[PDB]
Amino acid sequence: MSGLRVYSTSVTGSREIKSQQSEVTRILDGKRIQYQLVDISQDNALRDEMRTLAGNPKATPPQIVNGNHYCGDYELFVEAVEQDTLQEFLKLA
Amino acid sequence: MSGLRVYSTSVTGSREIKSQQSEVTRILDGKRIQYQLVDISQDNALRDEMRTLAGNPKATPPQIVNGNHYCGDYELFVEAVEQDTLQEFLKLA
16 A cells, blocks of 8 residues: 555553544544554654654654655644545645 | 534533544534534533433433434444444434
């Protein structure tokens, strides 16, 4: 596969991260949009890749990318859901 | 017009209710499903209606109804999304 990807973590104490990643993936599931779910837990290279693509060394999941194009984070994903620009956000358009 | 109503509250100290009701509606908005958003904090007669329809005197938002037909709560809604059966859950089919 090469295309849309969501970075997530399966092990974390953060309620924000867990709520936000679950919302992103459930919205995508609701729209029947295919994506690769990447779990970064205990793999620093995955965490670093996510951070490099987001251009933010403190980024946390969820983070969405399509190929090597960064799409954005939770806030901008939900903005696109509400404003109906999710095809553009996700670089599917 | 769907007949769909989502019971919600605009005033709560529960992070779980806020999170859950946001997820329901963002998923519905993602799918372009129309619904009336009912805010039970506007009066207890609405909370009363939600609870008798849900069959549970301790029910909290979100709760989803299509007309007089109760569809379910957060957990049942998420199960329908993850199992690809939202249209049946919402009694749109």
